[PDB]
């Protein structure tokens, strides 16, 4: 079977001095119009369809496995907020959810806030970006996208008679906050071209959208604009944030005249985020360390910040929650997430204990501070995702809801925390899981997942889909490679920019170790990763093709240099502090040397499935497309290279959820076939 050969159109870049010829630069089209591009993608999709056609039997098997353990009757965990209990209801034969609420003192009746299906009537796309009731519980602001271009139209509704307002606020990010008069909101506007949150406008609910005065214009290109509100309900915060630096202006939520009040001016490498409660500010700042500390102050002035939790080399401070008698904080240490409660008055401390070798715990939704009930999540590789409600005074823990998993008995699966000494001497943590009865050291197929970017952690949690693999001899693995945030800020900074090469080394080292230690079969080694995890993939294969038999590169970021050079591509402006700006010989040199597209050599590669989305936009469909074209011309091997490009538009990971389960069946079948 001859794979599709793309038309070679030489296009030289030439930056700083050295020239890169890109044969497949023409594959980029920002409108998705070009028939000649469409053809290559259709051709490549058609080839994929043909190669994977005998696996249909398995795909359907896996699809129904993964669907028949998920209740189509899905209610949420109800939360109280402003005296009303709020729940989301999914029911079969209905694509979008129904959001309901009831008086906190009420049981019998439930009121419909917004029905997605009703709003979806007569429209081609629907995605709910935001939904929040005004402080007085009379009005309902909602951020909806009826065109699905990641750009939301805010509308207001009166819950008394379910009547809507005249006006509609357009071109927003969906991020808004009510003022305490319940007739005035601030909202974040994107630019007409760049389409990145940079403007904050004040609207008076029921007035003209033209007469919505601009409040703040964020000039610095690298700074994302956001809107939070404090626990005190006193200040609406304008949270400016780049990847290293941050700034916070305050808006008086009680006065209808309030200009942004400078909290603490932005300083390079000082990331801070605030809250307000008990007539105090509570700040999480990295001014005295990478790992962050919690600080208290009467006013904004940085000098006046008292230290509550000083930064440490060994414990990352991730987040916090305020309550009447207790402070509760999110922390990591030794590759485990953990929680702590600290009494404001007494100073008493209580850790929350857990046996599991590979688990994740986190702070859940706690909107009302005046309670002794903490709400925190938990998940592991053997235990479904679970929400608990702990009484901070009595230590009594009640489980509010589990993840519902049918045809699943937990005792069938073993999990392990394995450390691996990397080439440079650094201990890299690993969270693996396998089926008890299928295991036999050195025979089992091995799937190594990894991300390792932005300081994002691949914390060991539960996966219902993963059971399809485990129940076929597989040992699924999470590699907590540098670039993620599993071992704190240091772990991220040691896996980005000039130390990005550590990410890929860490991945290869973990896989080799696990093979050497007999966790998996050395012939049937497989890997997988998405977006920045697809960058991981594209590099790993270039440098260590021998290791893996098969690969799944999801929506991969493989054309690193060219993409980061070209400003017109969105996301690029914020990612300068991640990979680097190749408008510097320094970063150009380093980035290029791992950049998977620039590093495609004429050698053997593993079996590979590259996936992408055309009309999703923020995937960059061409990066994988070009990458395959080049892999096809250069690779020396007989093994299969397939490119599936999604040609849809609507939905994503919910409502049109089943598309997401089709894609995983496609990929799992692919791997399973190779692993036979």
Only one residue has tokens 């890997």, namely: 527
Pairing state of beta strands 525-530 and 446-449? parallel
Q: How far is the C-alpha of 62 from the C-alpha of 52, rounded, in Å?
A: 14
What does DSSP assign to residue 224? B
Pairing state of beta strands 475-479 and 169-178? unpaired
216 bridge partner residues: 200
Phi, psi of 662 (to 5 degrees): -60, -50
Q: Which pair of tokens denotes residue 638?
A: 């007989």
Around Cβ 644, how many Cβ atoms within 10 Å? 22
Nearest Cα to Cα of residue 671 among 555, 556, 557, 554: 554
Nearest Cα to Cα of residue 253 among 232, 224, 278, 275: 232
C-alpha to C-alpha distances, 504 to 202, 482, 532, nearest whole angstrom: 46, 8, 11
- DSSP per position, 462-489: --TTTHHHHTTT-EEEEE--BTBSTT-H
Around Cβ 443, how many Cβ atoms within 10 Å? 12
Note the Cα 30 to chain centre separation in Å: 24
- Fold of the domain built from segment(s) 74-402: Methylamine Dehydrogenase; Chain H (2.130.10)
SS3 state at 27: helix
SS3 state at 145: strand
Burial of 262 (0-12, 13-18, 19+ CB in 10 A): exposed
| Cα radius of gyration (the chain) | 26
Torsion-angle region of 419 (φ positive above 0: left; ψ -120 to 50: alpha; else: beta): beta
Q: Which pair of tokens denotes residue 165?
A: 């307002």
Contact 474, 447 (CB under 8 A): yes
Residues annotated catalytic, as ranges: 531, 616, 651
3-state per-residue secondary structure call for 78-123: CEEECCEEEEEEECCCCCCCEEEEEECCCCCCCEEEEEHHHHHCCC
What does DSSP assign to residue 15? B
Contact 153, 134 (CB under 8 A): no
Around Cβ 549, how many Cβ atoms within 10 Å? 20
Contact 580, 497 (CB under 8 A): yes
Q: Name the percent of the chain in helix, strand, coil, to the closest 5.
A: 20, 35, 45
Nearest Cα to Cα of residue 294 among 276, 278, 309, 314: 309
249 bridge partner residues: 238, 262
| Alpha-carbon torsion angle 666, 667, 670, 676, nearest 10 | -110
> In units of Å, what resolution does this entry have?
2.7
Nearest Cα to Cα of residue 431 among 412, 443, 415: 415
Phi, psi of 416 (to 5 degrees): -145, 140
Nearest Cα to Cα of residue 482 among 549, 536, 433: 536
Pairing state of beta strands 413-421 and 397-402? unpaired
Method: X-ray
Question: Most distant CA pair in the chain: distance in Å?
Answer: 74
Pairing state of beta strands 550-554 and 607-613? parallel
Contact 197, 189 (CB under 8 A): yes
Around Cβ 28, how many Cβ atoms within 10 Å? 20
What does DSSP assign to residue 165? P
């Amino acid at each position: 079977m001859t794979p599709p050969k793309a038309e070679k159109r030489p296009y030289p870049i030439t930056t700083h001095g050295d020239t890169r010829v890109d044969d497949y630069y023409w594959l980029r089209d920002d409108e998705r119009t070009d028939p000649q591009v469409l053809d290559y993608l259709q051709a490549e999709n058609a080839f994929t369809d043909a190669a994977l056609k005998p696996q249909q039997a398995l795909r359907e098997t896996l699809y129904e496995e993964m669907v028949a353990r998920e209740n189509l009757y899905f209610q949420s965990v109800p939360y109280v907020r402003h005296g009303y209990r709020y729940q989301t209801r999914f029911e079969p034969g209905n694509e979008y959810a129904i959001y309901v609420r009831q008086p906190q003192a009420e049981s019998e009746h439930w009121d419909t806030l917004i029905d997605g299906n009703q709003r979806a009537e007569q429209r081609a796309f629907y995605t709910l970006g935001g939904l929040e009731v005004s402080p007085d519980n009379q009005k309902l602001a909602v951020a909806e996208d009826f065109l699905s271009r990641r750009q939301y139209d805010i509308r207001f509704k009166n819950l008394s008679d379910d009547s809507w307002t005249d006006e509609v606020l357009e071109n927003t990010s969906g991020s808004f906050e009510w003022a305490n008069d319940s007739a005035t909101v601030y909202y974040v506007r994107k630019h007409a071209k760049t389409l990145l949150p940079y403007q904050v406008y004040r609207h008076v609910v029921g007035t003209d959208p033209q007469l919505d005065e601009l409040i703040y214009e964020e000039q610095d290109d690298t700074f994302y604009v956001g809107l939070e509100k404090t626990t005190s309900d006193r200040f609406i915060l304008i949270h400016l944030s780049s990847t290293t630096t941050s700034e916070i202006l305050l808006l008086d939520a009680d006065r209808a005249d309030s200009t942004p009040q400078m909290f603490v001016p932005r300083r390079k490498d000082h990331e801070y985020g605030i809250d307000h409660y008990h007539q105090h500010f509570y700040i999480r700042s990295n001014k005295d360390g990478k790992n962050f500390g919690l600080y208290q102050s009467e006013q904004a002035d940085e000098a006046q910040w008292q230290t509550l939790i000083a930064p440490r080399i060994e414990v990352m401070l991730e987040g916090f929650s305020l309550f009447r008698d207790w402070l509760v904080v999110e922390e990591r240490s030794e590759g485990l997430t953990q929680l702590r409660q600290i009494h404001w008055q007494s100073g008493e401390v209580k850790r929350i204990a857990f046996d599991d070798p590979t688990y994740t715990t986190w702070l859940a939704y706690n909107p009302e501070p005046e309670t002794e009930l903490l709400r925190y999540g938990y998940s592991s590789m053997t235990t479904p995702t679970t929400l608990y409600e702990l009484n901070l005074d009595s230590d009594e823990r009640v489980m509010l809801k589990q993840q519902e998993v049918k045809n699943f008995t937990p005792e069938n699966y073993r999990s392990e925390r394995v450390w691996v000494k990397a080439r440079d001497g650094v201990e890299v943590p690993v969270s693996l899981v396998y089926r008890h009865d299928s295991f036999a050291r050195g025979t089992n197929p091995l799937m190594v997942y990894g991300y390792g970017s932005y300081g994002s952690s691949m914390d060991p949690a539960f996966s219902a889909s993963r059971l399809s693999l485990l129940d076929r001899g597989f040992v699924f693995v999470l590699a907590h490679i540098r670039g993620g945030g599993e071992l704190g800020q240091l772990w991220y900074e040691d896996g980005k920019l000039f130390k990005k090469q550590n990410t890929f080394n860490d991945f290869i080292d973990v896989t080799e170790a696990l093979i050497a230690q007999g966790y998996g079969d050395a012939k049937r080694v497989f890997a997988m990763g998405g977006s920045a995890g697809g960058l991981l993939m594209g590099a790993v294969i270039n440098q260590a093709p021998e290791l893996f038999n098969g690969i799944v590169a999801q929506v991969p970021f493989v054309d690193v240099v060219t993409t980061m050079l070209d400003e017109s591509i969105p996301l690029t402006t914020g990612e300068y502090d991640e990979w680097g700006n190749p408008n510097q010989q320094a970063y150009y040199d380093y980035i290029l040397q791992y950049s998977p597209y620039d590093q495609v050599k004429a050698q053997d590669y593993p079996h590979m499935l590259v996936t992408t989305g055309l009309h999703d936009s923020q995937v960059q469909y061409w990066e994988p497309a070009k990458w395959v074209a080049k892999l096809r011309e250069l690779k020396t091997d007989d093994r299969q290279l397939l490119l599936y490009t999604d040609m849809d538009s609507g939905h994503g990971g919910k409502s049109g959820r089943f598309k997401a389960y089709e894609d995983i069946a496609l990929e799992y079948a692919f791997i399973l076939a190779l692993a036979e």
